[PDB]
Every structure is written in structure tokens, then in C-alpha cells.
Amino acid sequence: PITLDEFLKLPETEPASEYIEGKIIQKPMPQGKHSAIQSECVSVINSVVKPQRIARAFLELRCTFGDHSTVPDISVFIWSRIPREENGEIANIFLIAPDWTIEILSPDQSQTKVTKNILHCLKHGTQMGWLIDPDEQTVFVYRPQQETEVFDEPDALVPVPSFASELHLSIKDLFSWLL
Amino acid sequence: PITLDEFLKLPETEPASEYIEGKIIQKPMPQGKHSAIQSECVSVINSVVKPQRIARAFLELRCTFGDHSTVPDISVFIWSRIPREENGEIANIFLIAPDWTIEILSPDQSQTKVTKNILHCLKHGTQMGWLIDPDEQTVFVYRPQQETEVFDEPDALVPVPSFASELHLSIKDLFSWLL
Ligand SMILES: [Cl-]
Ligand SMILES: [Cl-]
């Protein structure tokens, strides 16, 4: 029995807490496999979009919109959508959906909760969602009003939003980050 | 290292074995919660579609198509698509996709594998897929070329294919089958 406004006054937790459909759900504990893919994924995206100020990928950033407050594993925002203070530095609060959300499964994660979170992002303007399953070496690709797409062939390139089109990431390259 | 033709010559297992993307994957072990929803779900669908020979819901029926051989928890076929022998009785082999596939999660089930199986059905003519998550009291609804839809409000009706439009099943009714 808690509202979003009430939830946002509460202190941060480790792992972070999400406010989904009126419920407070704590994110899963960090795991080796999860961290390896997460850190390398942010690094590879930013190497492609950050130099020419196209976009920026953020680790564990809180996104509050559409009566939910979530913490995607990776949130990617195009430059024009990054909220900034008057001095030009990035704002502490993000009240908008990412342009590209990336979720990586870990043993204690709820795949149903993650899928709902990705679909909620798409409902509020997200261009693309990625659901990475390390165990199955699979990526589910989510686009607004389109059937979920499956990528699991080692040589297959995983689609990226058009602002990140210079990124050519194969399934084999992604899951090699576990090695 | 096995083909579909070779796989189909092999003996049946308990739990049943599926042939997906050239791999043999055994279904999860039966569980109480899973069986309660599965048995009641087949009963409720057939009470709506079997009397007027609209369709028929089958438990654990093997469906072999598009180089895969799967065993959906529940397969629903419209009357005109039920394969029949010369004498008019239902055939032992189904070489086509169900009109409606229903998958119910259980503790050892791979939600990624199930989603791939539902999406493979849609690629070969299935009208609708249901992914029931008893633990999260959620139903994911899959339609060809449409974004996945989420149903989790207790009073919400879960969509059904138009041949089964007389079925009005709420989320609360579905998960009450666990009580
Ligand atoms: Cl910046
Ligand atoms: Cl999906």
C-alpha cells in the first residue's frame, strides 16, 4: 500500500528497488556472469555512441515514468533526451523512458518482471529493448508494435537502434564476454 | 548431431522430449501447480469449443513442423485443421502448428525456450500463444506480428482466439485453479 510519490521519498537500497504496478521489488544480487556482460556491454555501446555525442549508455540508472520507477541494467539515451541542469551537467533524476533498454538475466531475476519492464518502456517511447539470457546465449529484441525477435545463432548480428547502427555485435561476440 | 527425421524414430521419454533448433531438450518434471492449471484449462476450453465442433484442446500433443518437434502443454486446433485418417478418426501424427498454443511455467521450465517455441508456432500459422506464469499470476499473450501483451489485473479478461470468443476467462479465475 504505497504510491510512486511516497516510494521516491524512500532511501536507495543495494540491490536497487523498483516500483512496478504499485509493488516494491528489489533487483537481484550482482553475479559474476551478469557483471561481465553488463560492464562490457556499456563499454562497447559508449565506444560507438559517446565520442560524437550521439548517445550515452548508463549503468543502473533509475528511470521514473508511467507510474513506475525502474532501474534497467543498462539505459541508453540519445543526446537530445539526456536531462541536464542549467550548467550543462547531467541531472540526477530521469523522468523519461530510455531510448534503448538492456536487461540481462541472472539466476535470481524474474524473467516475467523483466519482460513487463521492457514492455512498459516501449509503451512510454523506448525505441528498443534487449533481453539478454546468458545461460541460453540468446537475445530477445523488442520494438514498439512488433512481435518479439529472437537471436541465438553465433554468427547472427543483434539489431541495434539506428542511432547505434555502427555497432555490429554478433551473438558469439556478446557471450564471449563470459570467457 | 541429429536430424528431425532421425529424432522422430527415437522412443518417447517421461517428461517428453522436444527437438528445437537441432537440439533435444526434455520437458520439465510434472508439478502440482502446473497440473492443476493445465487440467482445468483443457477442460474449460473444451467446454466452450468441443460441443458445437468448433475446435478441440489436447493435452501434451506432439506437433512437428518447420524442422521442429514440440509438445505444447495444451494445443488447440480448429475442427477443419484436425488431421484425420480415411475412416474419419483423428490421426496419430500432427505435422502442423496448433491454432492456439498454451504454455504454463513450472520451476524447472526454461521461460526463454518456451517463448522461442511460442514464437516458432506463430511463424507457422498459430493464431495465438499464451504464456501462463503461475508464480507471477501473469499471462503473456502472443499474436502474429504484434508486440507481446501482458495480463495481470485480477478482473482483466485474458484474450482468446476468435473461434473461442465465448470463453470469458479472468486472471482471478485462472489462478484460482491453484486454490
Ligand atoms: Cl555528458
Ligand atoms: Cl516476449
Interface test mutation site (partner A, options B131, B147, B149, B151, max chain A beta carbons within 10 A): B147
CB < 8 Å to B152, chain A = 21, 116
Cα-Cα-Cα-Cα torsion A35, A41, A43, A44, nearest 10 degrees, comes to 150
Does the CB of B138 have a partner CB in chain A at under 8 Å? yes
CB B8 within 8 A of CB B69: yes
Q: What amino acid is encoded at B28 in this protein?
A: P
CB B57 within 8 A of CB B74: yes
For residue B38, how many other CB atoms are within 10 A of its CB?
Answer: 22
Interface test mutation site (partner B, options A23, A109, A111, max chain B beta carbons within 10 A): A111
Residue B131: CATH number of its domain: 3.90.1570.10
Domain count, chain B: 1
Contact A150 B116 (CB under 8 A): yes
Experimental method: X-ray
Could you tell me which chain B residue has the CA closest to the CA of A149? B119
Contact B152 A21 (CB under 8 A): yes
B124: phi then psi, degrees, rounded to nearest 5: -115, 25
Beta strand spans in B79-136 (E):
100-104, 128-133
Three cell numbers, residue B49: 469449443
Three cell numbers, residue B117: 517455441
Three cell numbers, residue B170: 479472468
Does the CB of B21 have a partner CB in chain A at under 8 Å? yes
Triad A77, A93, A83: Cα angle to 5°: 45
| Structure's resolution in angstroms | 2.0
CB A104 within 8 A of CB A75: no
Q: After which residues is chain B broken (C to N over 2.5 A)?
A: none
Three cell numbers, residue B69: 518437434
Q: Tell me the residue range of the domain where B113 lies.
A: 1-179
SS3 state at A167: coil
CA dist., res. A8 & res. A25, Å (int): 13
Element of type H or E holding A104 = strand A100-104
Element of type H or E holding A23 = strand A23-26
CA dist., res. A103 & res. B160, Å (int): 30
CA dist., res. B151 & res. A158, Å (int): 28
Does the CB of A59 have a partner CB in chain B at under 8 Å? no
β pairing state of B138-142 and B128-133: antiparallel
CB A100 within 8 A of CB A76: yes
